[PDB]
Symmetry: C5
Subunit: 103 residues, 5 copies
Protein backbone atom coordinates (compact mmCIF):
# COMPACT_ATOMS: atom_id res chain seq x y z
CA UNK A 1 0.00 0.00 0.00
CA UNK A 2 2.53 2.73 0.87
CA UNK A 3 4.74 2.96 -2.28
CA UNK A 4 8.02 4.25 -0.86
CA UNK A 5 9.78 4.70 2.47
CA UNK A 6 8.48 8.23 2.99
CA UNK A 7 4.79 7.20 2.76
CA UNK A 8 5.47 4.20 4.95
CA UNK A 9 7.33 6.25 7.55
CA UNK A 10 4.38 8.64 7.62
CA UNK A 11 2.10 5.88 8.99
CA UNK A 12 3.72 5.92 12.43
CA UNK A 13 4.11 8.52 15.18
CA UNK A 14 7.56 9.47 16.47
CA UNK A 15 9.23 8.71 13.14
CA UNK A 16 11.45 10.85 10.93
CA UNK A 17 13.31 10.40 7.68
CA UNK A 18 17.10 10.78 7.63
CA UNK A 19 18.49 11.18 4.14
CA UNK A 20 22.00 9.75 4.23
CA UNK A 21 22.99 8.77 0.68
CA UNK A 22 26.15 7.24 2.17
CA UNK A 23 27.64 3.93 3.21
CA UNK A 24 27.53 2.70 6.79
CA UNK A 25 30.67 3.75 8.63
CA UNK A 26 30.69 1.17 11.42
CA UNK A 27 28.66 -1.91 12.40
CA UNK A 28 28.35 -3.17 15.97
CA UNK A 29 26.60 -6.37 16.98
CA UNK A 30 25.95 -7.72 20.46
CA UNK A 31 25.03 -11.16 21.81
CA UNK A 32 25.20 -9.98 25.46
CA UNK A 33 22.06 -10.80 27.47
CA UNK A 34 19.42 -8.05 27.46
CA UNK A 35 21.46 -6.30 24.71
CA UNK A 36 20.91 -8.52 21.66
CA UNK A 37 21.11 -5.57 19.30
CA UNK A 38 23.06 -4.01 16.43
CA UNK A 39 24.26 -0.40 16.23
CA UNK A 40 25.38 1.43 13.11
CA UNK A 41 26.91 4.83 12.55
CA UNK A 42 27.63 6.98 9.55
CA UNK A 43 30.64 9.25 8.89
CA UNK A 44 28.74 12.34 10.14
CA UNK A 45 28.48 10.60 13.54
CA UNK A 46 24.74 9.80 13.28
CA UNK A 47 24.00 6.63 15.25
CA UNK A 48 21.04 4.24 14.88
CA UNK A 49 20.14 0.90 16.44
CA UNK A 50 17.99 -2.10 15.70
CA UNK A 51 16.13 -2.48 18.96
CA UNK A 52 16.26 -5.47 21.26
CA UNK A 53 12.99 -7.35 20.66
CA UNK A 54 10.46 -6.55 23.37
CA UNK A 55 6.76 -6.05 24.25
CA UNK A 56 6.52 -2.96 22.04
CA UNK A 57 6.93 -5.34 19.04
CA UNK A 58 4.09 -7.48 17.75
CA UNK A 59 4.80 -11.05 16.61
CA UNK A 60 5.01 -10.22 12.90
CA UNK A 61 7.92 -7.91 13.71
CA UNK A 62 10.01 -10.74 15.13
CA UNK A 63 11.10 -12.04 11.72
CA UNK A 64 11.55 -8.50 10.28
CA UNK A 65 13.87 -7.42 13.12
CA UNK A 66 16.24 -10.32 12.35
CA UNK A 67 16.10 -9.67 8.57
CA UNK A 68 17.02 -6.01 9.24
CA UNK A 69 20.13 -7.03 11.15
CA UNK A 70 21.05 -9.31 8.24
CA UNK A 71 20.50 -6.45 5.77
CA UNK A 72 22.60 -3.95 7.70
CA UNK A 73 25.48 -6.37 8.04
CA UNK A 74 25.51 -7.12 4.31
CA UNK A 75 24.95 -3.48 3.31
CA UNK A 76 27.93 -2.70 5.53
CA UNK A 77 30.22 -5.37 4.12
CA UNK A 78 29.40 -4.56 0.50
CA UNK A 79 29.56 -0.83 1.17
CA UNK A 80 26.13 -0.26 -0.27
CA UNK A 81 24.91 3.32 -0.24
CA UNK A 82 21.91 3.69 2.04
CA UNK A 83 19.60 6.37 0.75
CA UNK A 84 17.16 6.91 3.58
CA UNK A 85 16.33 5.57 7.00
CA UNK A 86 12.94 5.84 8.69
CA UNK A 87 13.58 5.99 12.41
CA UNK A 88 11.66 6.24 15.64
CA UNK A 89 13.10 9.28 17.39
CA UNK A 90 11.61 8.54 20.85
CA UNK A 91 14.53 6.14 21.44
CA UNK A 92 18.24 6.82 21.83
CA UNK A 93 20.02 5.95 19.64
CA UNK A 94 17.20 6.40 17.08
CA UNK A 95 15.59 3.06 16.22
CA UNK A 96 15.48 1.84 12.58
CA UNK A 97 11.97 1.22 11.20
CA UNK A 98 12.90 0.88 7.50
CA UNK A 99 15.79 1.42 5.04
CA UNK A 100 16.01 2.44 1.42
CA UNK A 101 19.10 1.72 -0.70
CA UNK A 102 19.32 3.15 -4.19
CA UNK A 103 21.04 3.58 -7.54
Amino acid sequence: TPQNITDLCAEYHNTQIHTLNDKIFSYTESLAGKREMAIITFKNGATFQVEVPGSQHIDSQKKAIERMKDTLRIAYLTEAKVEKLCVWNNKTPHAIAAISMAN
Copy 2:
Protein backbone atom coordinates in the same frame (compact mmCIF):
# COMPACT_ATOMS: atom_id res chain seq x y z
CA THR B 1 4.63 -28.71 -14.20
CA PRO B 2 5.02 -25.13 -15.47
CA GLN B 3 8.34 -24.99 -17.35
CA ASN B 4 8.83 -21.24 -17.04
CA ILE B 5 7.61 -18.06 -15.39
CA THR B 6 5.10 -17.30 -18.18
CA ASP B 7 3.35 -20.66 -17.86
CA LEU B 8 3.44 -20.43 -14.11
CA CYS B 9 1.93 -16.95 -14.17
CA ALA B 10 -0.87 -18.09 -16.46
CA GLU B 11 -2.06 -20.48 -13.71
CA TYR B 12 -3.45 -17.66 -11.57
CA HIS B 13 -6.12 -15.00 -11.98
CA ASN B 14 -5.22 -11.32 -11.89
CA THR B 15 -1.58 -11.79 -12.90
CA GLN B 16 0.53 -10.33 -15.67
CA ILE B 17 4.12 -10.55 -16.85
CA HIS B 18 6.47 -7.58 -16.93
CA THR B 19 9.63 -7.82 -18.99
CA LEU B 20 12.21 -5.55 -17.47
CA ASN B 21 15.59 -7.00 -18.45
CA ASP B 22 17.18 -4.57 -16.01
CA LYS B 23 18.69 -4.45 -12.54
CA ILE B 24 16.71 -3.36 -9.48
CA PHE B 25 17.09 0.40 -9.00
CA SER B 26 16.14 0.67 -5.30
CA TYR B 27 15.27 -1.69 -2.46
CA THR B 28 13.29 -0.72 0.64
CA GLU B 29 12.73 -2.97 3.62
CA SER B 30 10.49 -2.36 6.63
CA LEU B 31 10.15 -3.99 10.06
CA ALA B 32 7.37 -1.57 11.15
CA GLY B 33 4.37 -3.37 12.64
CA LYS B 34 1.77 -4.27 10.02
CA ARG B 35 4.16 -3.08 7.32
CA GLU B 36 6.75 -5.86 7.44
CA MET B 37 7.37 -5.77 3.68
CA ALA B 38 9.83 -4.94 0.87
CA ILE B 39 9.35 -2.64 -2.11
CA ILE B 40 11.53 -2.49 -5.19
CA THR B 41 11.86 -0.06 -8.04
CA PHE B 42 13.35 -0.05 -11.53
CA LYS B 43 14.78 2.92 -13.47
CA ASN B 44 11.56 3.71 -15.37
CA GLY B 45 9.74 4.11 -12.01
CA ALA B 46 7.82 0.79 -12.01
CA THR B 47 7.19 -0.21 -8.38
CA PHE B 48 6.53 -3.71 -6.97
CA GLN B 49 6.01 -5.12 -3.45
CA VAL B 50 6.43 -8.42 -1.61
CA GLU B 51 3.17 -8.38 0.36
CA VAL B 52 2.87 -8.38 4.15
CA PRO B 53 2.03 -12.02 5.06
CA GLY B 54 -1.75 -12.08 5.55
CA SER B 55 -4.89 -14.25 5.29
CA GLN B 56 -4.69 -14.47 1.48
CA HIS B 57 -1.56 -16.62 1.91
CA ILE B 58 -1.64 -20.35 2.56
CA ASP B 59 0.86 -21.91 4.98
CA SER B 60 3.09 -23.09 2.18
CA GLN B 61 3.90 -19.67 0.88
CA LYS B 62 5.13 -18.13 4.16
CA LYS B 63 8.66 -19.55 3.75
CA ALA B 64 8.48 -18.66 0.07
CA ILE B 65 7.63 -15.07 0.98
CA GLU B 66 10.69 -14.95 3.22
CA ARG B 67 12.86 -16.46 0.51
CA MET B 68 11.63 -13.83 -2.02
CA LYS B 69 12.70 -10.87 0.17
CA ASP B 70 16.12 -12.60 0.49
CA THR B 71 16.29 -13.02 -3.29
CA LEU B 72 15.45 -9.37 -3.97
CA ARG B 73 18.07 -8.13 -1.52
CA ILE B 74 21.08 -10.00 -3.09
CA ALA B 75 19.70 -9.44 -6.57
CA TYR B 76 19.89 -5.74 -5.69
CA LEU B 77 23.28 -5.81 -3.97
CA THR B 78 24.75 -7.77 -6.85
CA GLU B 79 23.05 -5.71 -9.63
CA ALA B 80 21.67 -8.88 -11.11
CA LYS B 81 19.45 -8.35 -14.14
CA VAL B 82 15.92 -9.52 -13.59
CA GLU B 83 14.29 -10.78 -16.74
CA LYS B 84 10.61 -10.99 -15.86
CA LEU B 85 8.26 -10.54 -12.93
CA CYS B 86 4.90 -12.29 -12.67
CA VAL B 87 2.79 -10.00 -10.53
CA TRP B 88 -0.74 -9.85 -9.19
CA ASN B 89 -2.30 -6.72 -10.71
CA ASN B 90 -5.16 -6.52 -8.19
CA LYS B 91 -2.86 -4.85 -5.62
CA THR B 92 -0.98 -1.50 -5.58
CA PRO B 93 2.01 -1.57 -5.84
CA HIS B 94 1.80 -4.71 -7.94
CA ALA B 95 2.62 -7.71 -5.79
CA ILE B 96 5.40 -10.07 -6.81
CA ALA B 97 4.36 -13.66 -7.47
CA ALA B 98 7.50 -14.97 -9.21
CA ILE B 99 10.76 -13.70 -10.62
CA SER B 100 13.13 -14.77 -13.35
CA MET B 101 16.71 -13.62 -13.75
CA ALA B 102 18.76 -14.29 -16.88
CA ASN B 103 22.41 -13.80 -17.90
Copy 3:
Protein backbone atom coordinates in the same frame (compact mmCIF):
# COMPACT_ATOMS: atom_id res chain seq x y z
CA THR C 1 27.74 -44.20 2.05
CA PRO C 2 28.10 -42.66 -1.46
CA GLN C 3 31.45 -41.14 -2.43
CA ASN C 4 30.14 -39.00 -5.29
CA ILE C 5 26.99 -37.80 -7.08
CA THR C 6 26.90 -40.71 -9.59
CA ASP C 7 26.87 -43.44 -6.94
CA LEU C 8 24.34 -41.47 -4.89
CA CYS C 9 22.17 -41.12 -7.97
CA ALA C 10 22.42 -44.86 -8.69
CA GLU C 11 20.73 -45.57 -5.33
CA TYR C 12 17.48 -44.16 -6.55
CA HIS C 13 14.60 -45.30 -8.70
CA ASN C 14 13.77 -43.18 -11.74
CA THR C 15 16.93 -41.10 -11.45
CA GLN C 16 19.34 -39.96 -14.15
CA ILE C 17 22.61 -37.97 -14.39
CA HIS C 18 23.14 -34.98 -16.69
CA THR C 19 26.64 -33.54 -17.20
CA LEU C 20 26.54 -29.86 -17.91
CA ASN C 21 29.89 -28.35 -17.02
CA ASP C 22 28.24 -24.99 -17.55
CA LYS C 23 26.90 -22.16 -15.43
CA ILE C 24 23.18 -21.65 -14.86
CA PHE C 25 21.58 -19.56 -17.57
CA SER C 26 18.31 -18.77 -15.77
CA TYR C 27 17.01 -18.87 -12.24
CA THR C 28 13.28 -18.60 -11.52
CA GLU C 29 11.47 -18.67 -8.22
CA SER C 30 7.85 -18.51 -7.20
CA LEU C 31 6.02 -17.72 -4.01
CA ALA C 32 2.68 -18.40 -5.78
CA GLY C 33 0.43 -20.69 -3.69
CA LYS C 34 0.81 -24.39 -4.55
CA ARG C 35 3.73 -23.48 -6.81
CA GLU C 36 6.44 -22.68 -4.28
CA MET C 37 9.28 -23.83 -6.50
CA ALA C 38 12.44 -22.76 -8.36
CA ILE C 39 13.29 -23.50 -12.00
CA ILE C 40 16.72 -23.31 -13.61
CA THR C 41 17.78 -23.56 -17.24
CA PHE C 42 21.09 -23.86 -19.10
CA LYS C 43 22.08 -22.55 -22.55
CA ASN C 44 21.37 -25.94 -24.13
CA GLY C 45 17.68 -25.50 -23.19
CA ALA C 46 17.78 -28.04 -20.35
CA THR C 47 15.21 -27.17 -17.71
CA PHE C 48 15.13 -28.57 -14.19
CA GLN C 49 12.99 -27.88 -11.19
CA VAL C 50 13.23 -28.14 -7.44
CA GLU C 51 9.81 -29.61 -6.69
CA VAL C 52 7.15 -28.10 -4.50
CA PRO C 53 7.39 -29.80 -1.07
CA GLY C 54 4.75 -32.47 -0.45
CA SER C 55 3.71 -36.09 0.13
CA GLN C 56 6.63 -37.51 -1.88
CA HIS C 57 8.94 -35.96 0.74
CA ILE C 58 10.03 -37.21 4.13
CA ASP C 59 10.58 -34.84 7.04
CA SER C 60 14.34 -34.92 6.48
CA GLN C 61 14.08 -33.69 2.92
CA LYS C 62 12.33 -30.54 4.08
CA LYS C 63 15.35 -28.53 5.18
CA ALA C 64 17.26 -30.03 2.22
CA ILE C 65 14.77 -28.71 -0.34
CA GLU C 66 15.14 -25.23 1.17
CA ARG C 67 18.92 -25.61 1.18
CA MET C 68 18.96 -26.63 -2.52
CA LYS C 69 17.04 -23.48 -3.53
CA ASP C 70 19.60 -21.34 -1.68
CA THR C 71 22.43 -23.19 -3.46
CA LEU C 72 20.91 -22.74 -6.90
CA ARG C 73 20.38 -19.04 -6.26
CA ILE C 74 23.93 -18.34 -5.15
CA ALA C 75 25.42 -20.61 -7.84
CA TYR C 76 23.47 -18.60 -10.43
CA LEU C 77 24.58 -15.22 -9.03
CA THR C 78 28.25 -16.23 -8.71
CA GLU C 79 28.22 -17.92 -12.16
CA ALA C 80 29.51 -21.17 -10.69
CA LYS C 81 29.86 -24.04 -13.12
CA VAL C 82 27.51 -26.86 -12.35
CA GLU C 83 29.28 -30.13 -13.02
CA LYS C 84 26.46 -32.68 -12.80
CA LEU C 85 22.91 -32.97 -11.57
CA CYS C 86 21.23 -36.14 -10.37
CA VAL C 87 17.65 -35.80 -11.56
CA TRP C 88 14.37 -37.72 -11.23
CA ASN C 89 12.98 -38.35 -14.73
CA ASN C 90 9.41 -39.25 -13.74
CA LYS C 91 8.70 -35.50 -13.54
CA THR C 92 8.60 -32.59 -16.00
CA PRO C 93 10.64 -30.58 -15.87
CA HIS C 94 13.12 -33.07 -14.37
CA ALA C 95 13.25 -32.64 -10.58
CA ILE C 96 16.66 -32.03 -8.97
CA ALA C 97 17.93 -34.61 -6.42
CA ALA C 98 21.57 -33.62 -6.09
CA ILE C 99 24.12 -31.26 -7.58
CA SER C 100 27.90 -31.24 -7.95
CA MET C 101 30.01 -28.18 -8.67
CA ALA C 102 33.64 -28.50 -9.69
CA ASN C 103 36.10 -25.69 -10.44
Copy 4:
Protein backbone atom coordinates in the same frame (compact mmCIF):
# COMPACT_ATOMS: atom_id res chain seq x y z
CA THR D 1 20.87 1.99 25.68
CA PRO D 2 24.60 2.14 24.82
CA GLN D 3 25.64 4.11 21.74
CA ASN D 4 28.84 2.12 21.10
CA ILE D 5 30.61 -1.09 22.04
CA THR D 6 32.72 0.54 24.80
CA ASP D 7 29.62 1.66 26.72
CA LEU D 8 27.72 -1.60 26.05
CA CYS D 9 30.69 -3.58 27.31
CA ALA D 10 30.75 -1.46 30.46
CA GLU D 11 27.28 -2.70 31.41
CA TYR D 12 28.73 -6.13 32.28
CA HIS D 13 31.05 -7.59 34.94
CA ASN D 14 34.08 -9.62 33.88
CA THR D 15 33.93 -7.88 30.52
CA GLN D 16 36.99 -6.41 28.79
CA ILE D 17 37.29 -4.40 25.54
CA HIS D 18 39.88 -5.20 22.87
CA THR D 19 41.02 -2.84 20.09
CA LEU D 20 42.30 -4.95 17.17
CA ASN D 21 41.88 -2.98 13.99
CA ASP D 22 42.84 -6.02 11.90
CA LYS D 23 40.99 -8.66 9.85
CA ILE D 24 40.51 -12.08 11.45
CA PHE D 25 43.45 -14.38 10.92
CA SER D 26 41.82 -17.81 11.40
CA TYR D 27 38.25 -18.99 11.73
CA THR D 28 37.57 -22.41 13.30
CA GLU D 29 34.11 -23.96 13.43
CA SER D 30 33.06 -27.20 15.13
CA LEU D 31 30.02 -29.50 14.93
CA ALA D 32 31.52 -32.02 17.45
CA GLY D 33 29.07 -32.85 20.24
CA LYS D 34 29.46 -30.64 23.33
CA ARG D 35 31.86 -28.47 21.28
CA GLU D 36 29.54 -26.63 18.87
CA MET D 37 31.52 -23.44 18.80
CA ALA D 38 33.64 -21.12 16.70
CA ILE D 39 37.10 -19.79 17.44
CA ILE D 40 38.83 -16.83 15.87
CA THR D 41 42.45 -15.65 16.10
CA PHE D 42 44.28 -12.49 15.14
CA LYS D 43 47.83 -12.21 13.70
CA ASN D 44 49.00 -10.93 17.10
CA GLY D 45 47.92 -14.32 18.44
CA ALA D 46 44.85 -13.02 20.26
CA THR D 47 42.35 -15.94 20.44
CA PHE D 48 38.62 -15.71 21.13
CA GLN D 49 35.69 -18.13 21.21
CA VAL D 50 31.91 -17.95 20.74
CA GLU D 51 30.68 -20.14 23.62
CA VAL D 52 28.89 -23.40 23.21
CA PRO D 53 25.35 -22.31 24.04
CA GLY D 54 25.06 -23.24 27.73
CA SER D 55 22.93 -22.53 30.81
CA GLN D 56 24.57 -19.19 31.47
CA HIS D 57 22.58 -18.01 28.44
CA ILE D 58 19.03 -16.73 28.52
CA ASP D 59 16.65 -17.64 25.71
CA SER D 60 16.95 -14.23 23.96
CA GLN D 61 20.66 -14.93 23.36
CA LYS D 62 20.21 -18.17 21.46
CA LYS D 63 19.34 -16.66 18.09
CA ALA D 64 22.07 -14.04 18.80
CA ILE D 65 24.85 -16.64 19.29
CA GLU D 66 23.95 -18.08 15.85
CA ARG D 67 24.07 -14.62 14.23
CA MET D 68 27.53 -13.95 15.75
CA LYS D 69 29.01 -17.07 14.21
CA ASP D 70 27.49 -15.99 10.84
CA THR D 71 29.08 -12.58 11.30
CA LEU D 72 32.49 -14.02 12.19
CA ARG D 73 32.41 -16.31 9.16
CA ILE D 74 31.50 -13.55 6.68
CA ALA D 75 33.87 -10.93 8.18
CA TYR D 76 36.68 -13.49 7.92
CA LEU D 77 35.88 -14.41 4.31
CA THR D 78 35.66 -10.77 3.25
CA GLU D 79 38.76 -9.74 5.25
CA ALA D 80 36.87 -7.02 7.10
CA LYS D 81 38.78 -5.07 9.72
CA VAL D 82 37.29 -5.65 13.15
CA GLU D 83 37.77 -2.62 15.33
CA LYS D 84 37.02 -3.74 18.88
CA LEU D 85 35.84 -6.80 20.75
CA CYS D 86 34.00 -6.82 24.05
CA VAL D 87 34.88 -10.13 25.65
CA TRP D 88 34.06 -11.79 28.97
CA ASN D 89 37.44 -12.56 30.54
CA ASN D 90 36.25 -15.17 33.06
CA LYS D 91 36.60 -17.67 30.17
CA THR D 92 39.51 -19.20 28.21
CA PRO D 93 39.73 -18.37 25.36
CA HIS D 94 37.99 -15.06 26.19
CA ALA D 95 34.35 -15.21 25.06
CA ILE D 96 33.01 -12.74 22.46
CA ALA D 97 30.18 -10.60 23.81
CA ALA D 98 30.00 -7.93 21.08
CA ILE D 99 32.01 -6.92 18.03
CA SER D 100 32.54 -3.67 16.12
CA MET D 101 33.67 -3.30 12.54
CA ALA D 102 34.82 0.04 11.28
CA ASN D 103 37.04 -0.16 8.30
Copy 5:
Protein backbone atom coordinates in the same frame (compact mmCIF):
# COMPACT_ATOMS: atom_id res chain seq x y z
CA THR E 1 37.99 -25.35 26.48
CA PRO E 2 40.23 -26.01 23.45
CA GLN E 3 42.01 -22.99 21.97
CA ASN E 4 42.42 -24.58 18.52
CA ILE E 5 41.31 -27.33 16.10
CA THR E 6 43.99 -29.88 17.03
CA ASP E 7 43.20 -29.69 20.76
CA LEU E 8 39.47 -29.92 19.98
CA CYS E 9 40.01 -32.90 17.70
CA ALA E 10 41.98 -34.58 20.48
CA GLU E 11 38.84 -34.62 22.70
CA TYR E 12 37.15 -37.35 20.67
CA HIS E 13 37.89 -40.94 19.78
CA ASN E 14 38.26 -42.06 16.18
CA THR E 15 39.37 -38.61 14.92
CA GLN E 16 42.34 -37.27 12.91
CA ILE E 17 43.65 -33.93 11.65
CA HIS E 18 44.30 -33.43 7.93
CA THR E 19 46.21 -30.31 6.97
CA LEU E 20 45.06 -29.23 3.52
CA ASN E 21 46.05 -25.58 3.08
CA ASP E 22 44.15 -25.63 -0.20
CA LYS E 23 40.69 -24.70 -1.46
CA ILE E 24 37.84 -27.14 -1.95
CA PHE E 25 37.89 -28.71 -5.38
CA SER E 26 34.27 -29.84 -5.69
CA TYR E 27 31.07 -29.53 -3.68
CA THR E 28 28.21 -31.99 -3.85
CA GLU E 29 24.84 -31.54 -2.23
CA SER E 30 21.87 -33.94 -2.09
CA LEU E 31 18.19 -33.60 -1.12
CA ALA E 32 17.56 -37.32 -1.89
CA GLY E 33 15.58 -39.14 0.81
CA LYS E 34 17.86 -40.42 3.59
CA ARG E 35 20.93 -39.10 1.74
CA GLU E 36 20.63 -35.41 2.72
CA MET E 37 24.33 -34.71 2.99
CA ALA E 38 27.21 -32.78 1.38
CA ILE E 39 30.48 -34.22 0.07
CA ILE E 40 33.57 -32.14 -0.64
CA THR E 41 36.82 -33.13 -2.36
CA PHE E 42 40.26 -31.55 -2.82
CA LYS E 43 42.42 -31.91 -5.94
CA ASN E 44 44.56 -34.52 -4.17
CA GLY E 45 41.52 -36.81 -4.17
CA ALA E 46 40.68 -36.29 -0.50
CA THR E 47 36.89 -36.75 -0.14
CA PHE E 48 34.96 -35.87 3.03
CA GLN E 49 31.30 -35.90 4.04
CA VAL E 50 29.02 -34.00 6.37
CA GLU E 51 26.90 -36.88 7.69
CA VAL E 52 23.17 -37.11 7.26
CA PRO E 53 21.78 -36.38 10.76
CA GLY E 54 20.91 -39.57 12.62
CA SER E 55 20.88 -41.31 16.00
CA GLN E 56 24.61 -40.64 16.65
CA HIS E 57 23.91 -36.92 16.83
CA ILE E 58 22.82 -35.05 19.91
CA ASP E 59 20.28 -32.23 19.75
CA SER E 60 22.91 -29.49 20.09
CA GLN E 61 24.66 -30.82 16.99
CA LYS E 62 21.67 -30.38 14.69
CA LYS E 63 22.12 -26.68 13.82
CA ALA E 64 25.91 -27.20 13.85
CA ILE E 65 25.43 -29.71 11.04
CA GLU E 66 23.34 -27.26 8.99
CA ARG E 67 25.85 -24.49 9.64
CA MET E 68 28.80 -26.65 8.52
CA LYS E 69 27.07 -27.22 5.16
CA ASP E 70 26.58 -23.45 4.76
CA THR E 71 30.26 -23.00 5.57
CA LEU E 72 31.50 -25.58 3.08
CA ARG E 73 29.27 -24.08 0.38
CA ILE E 74 30.47 -20.55 0.96
CA ALA E 75 34.11 -21.63 1.34
CA TYR E 76 33.85 -23.54 -1.90
CA LEU E 77 32.26 -20.66 -3.86
CA THR E 78 34.73 -18.09 -2.51
CA GLU E 79 37.80 -20.35 -2.94
CA ALA E 80 38.71 -19.86 0.71
CA LYS E 81 41.80 -21.82 1.62
CA VAL E 82 40.99 -24.48 4.18
CA GLU E 83 43.77 -25.01 6.69
CA LYS E 84 42.84 -28.16 8.62
CA LEU E 85 39.91 -30.52 9.05
CA CYS E 86 39.14 -32.67 12.08
CA VAL E 87 37.48 -35.83 10.84
CA TRP E 88 36.01 -39.06 12.24
CA ASN E 89 37.93 -41.91 10.67
CA ASN E 90 35.31 -44.55 11.50
CA LYS E 91 33.01 -43.51 8.60
CA THR E 92 33.42 -43.70 4.81
CA PRO E 93 33.89 -41.12 3.48
CA HIS E 94 35.46 -39.69 6.64
CA ALA E 95 33.05 -37.32 8.41
CA ILE E 96 33.91 -33.69 9.08
CA ALA E 97 33.88 -32.72 12.78
CA ALA E 98 35.53 -29.28 12.61
CA ILE E 99 37.20 -27.00 10.10
CA SER E 100 39.83 -24.26 10.37
CA MET E 101 40.40 -21.67 7.69
CA ALA E 102 43.38 -19.36 7.51
CA ASN E 103 44.33 -17.74 4.23
